[PDB]
Design a protein around this ligand. Structure first.
Ligand SMILES: N[C@@H](CCCC[NH3+])C(=O)O
Ligand SMILES: N[C@@H](CCCC[NH3+])C(=O)O
Ligand SMILES: [Mg+2]
Ligand SMILES: [Mg+2]
Ligand SMILES: [Mg+2]
Ligand SMILES: [Mg+2]
Ligand SMILES: [Mg+2]
Ligand SMILES: [Mg+2]
Ligand SMILES: [Mg+2]
Ligand SMILES: [Mg+2]
Ligand SMILES: [Mg+2]
Ligand SMILES: [Mg+2]
Ligand SMILES: [Mg+2]
Lengths: 296, 296
């Protein structure tokens, strides 16, 4: 199977005057490239998928593909939707516009059954010929892709090569790789990047890497080389920022941190997302002081 | 405040050859009207909001407004979205096309903060001049509209007159009506319709009423007339069907029941929703046999 692994970043989507700051977007991805990141994920949850139009969603995928051309960095395009027809459309767009693969979040709100999830991802996988990474985050979607369903999709579909797990369930992470060791388990929860990697996970799709790409990059590559003492040291070191970046709902804290670091021009969200509390703003600002934040 | 209360139905959306069966849709609404229902809710969760296009979502609102014209039955149009700009657009469409009010689900997937929920609903309420009913269903959205936020929105926004609660939290329903007794608490949980009404709730937005509109209507009207013994009697009798209609994720069981009752033409969903397992199909069919289903 073709895979996309290593250190990956769930890209924030900067706004300027209520519109996607496409030049800031390209600059941020380009900063990621220059700091050891292996792949970028445009328009995930962290990229405010929900509030982008289908045209802006597609524009962000294009900017990512263009910016990464001529580099080793891959584009794992965010292509999820709770409507199968729409997820297939995003998958086909990403394939036709040069993405190396797609991430596809489990359908949110409408809570499909395991059978429905299987048919949902199989239709997505059959629509294109690029790798497809499942994305399980039950706290946001209201549904869970079971281990059995994940393993079935991995074995039944050629392009489905693994899962990004944001479920706080290291037991499930053991379950997955003990019964199907060929799949690529990707950490979608920064605080436990090292435990997932140390159990045979092969990469991360990180929120923290938006702010500290070099540290997340080093952590992942240390761990992939089985340098667990160095990988764990970084993971323990990052715990404080990893947790404070979810003081409020992601991506509210990470965008707050990027703004405080001078990496984006304005602390702008699209409703229903909003600025952090004044208190959490100060808490984010205080935790950042213990870290070396790279500029451009 | 301007209000829409009483017995209300979260309308299923019948599909025929992958398209909205518009003549069946109108026929089902007239069946609701003829069985004592006070209002209909087009395109909720039960109406497969997630997988309808904007054109379809809008068409279903039109059919409901249009079919209920000349009757006492009101149209509480489903207008929720996890993107505030889209929720404002749906609200404005419903107002301009003759809906009596709108239902608006709390944003799903992107998990706004309480401040974000307030600004989300404030923007919706200011966009129209018709009543707005909040909709809290944390098991599907991943977020909760707190009691304080609901009460603030009720007091600060003219159009916001209550909430449809689908949270299995009768404590919160006491909390809401003890601190703000003027709001219209609406049950969004069929199994506990009577307990919510007996504590001062003023209506239901029912899934079960799709199949048994006469029974849900009678339950609500018994309770509103303070005949709690008869309202509880129907609630107790309906428990078995109320539960089996969620053996799988709504609206998979209710559409199965409507199809088994001969009320719709095909057991058709849009992916990622799918037909139930063969057990739950058989379980739904067996529970239905103990209830008298009205025809057309
Ligand atoms: N707000 C909708 C539409 C998003 C379209 C662009 N990703 C959703 O989250 O599914
Ligand atoms: N699937 C998207 C778009 C649906 C728009 C029509 N109701 C959502 O659930 O938000
Ligand atoms: Mg555009
Ligand atoms: Mg996705
Ligand atoms: Mg979508
Ligand atoms: Mg399809
Ligand atoms: Mg090495
Ligand atoms: Mg600054
Ligand atoms: Mg009436
Ligand atoms: Mg709604
Ligand atoms: Mg009253
Ligand atoms: Mg079966
Ligand atoms: Mg079964």
């Amino acid at each position: 199977k073709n895979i996309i692994i290593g250190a990956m970043t769930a890209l924030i989507t900067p706004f300027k005057n209520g519109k996607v700051d496409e030049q800031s977007y390209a600059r941020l991805i380009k900063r990621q490239i220059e700091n050891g990141i292996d792949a970028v994920v445009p328009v995930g949850t962290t990229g405010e998928s929900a509030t982008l139009t289908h045209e802006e969603h597609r524009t962000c995928i294009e900017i990512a593909v263009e910016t990464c051309k001529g580099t080793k960095v891959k584009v794992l395009a965010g292509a999820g939707s709770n409507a199968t027809h729409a997820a297939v459309g995003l998958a086909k767009f990403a394939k036709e516009h040069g993405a190396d693969g797609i991430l596809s979040v489990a359908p949110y709100y409408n809570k499909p059954t395991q059978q429905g999830l299987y048919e949902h991802y199989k239709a997505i996988a059959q629509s294109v010929d690029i790798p497809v990474l499942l994305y399980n985050v039950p706290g946001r979607t209201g549904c869970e892709i079971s281990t059995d369903t994940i393993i079935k999709l991995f074995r039944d579909c050629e392009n489905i090569y693994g899962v990004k797990e944001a479920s706080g369930n290291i037991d499930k992470c053991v379950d997955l790789l003990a019964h199907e060791p060929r799949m690529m388990l990707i950490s979608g929860e920064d605080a436990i990047n090292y435990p997932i990697l140390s159990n045979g996970g092969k990469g991360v799709i990180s929120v923290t890497s938006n702010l500290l790409p070099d540290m997340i990059s080093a952590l992942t590559h240390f761990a992939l080389d089985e340098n667990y003492k160095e990988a764990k040291k970084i993971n323990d070191e990052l715990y404080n920022i990893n947790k404070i970046l979810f003081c409020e709902s992601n991506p509210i804290p990470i965008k707050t941190a990027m703004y405080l670091a001078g990496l984006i021009e304005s602390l702008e969200f699209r409703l229903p997302l909003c600025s952090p509390s004044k208190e959490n703003f100060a808490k984010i600002e205080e935790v950042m002081k213990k870290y070396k934040i790279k500029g451009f």
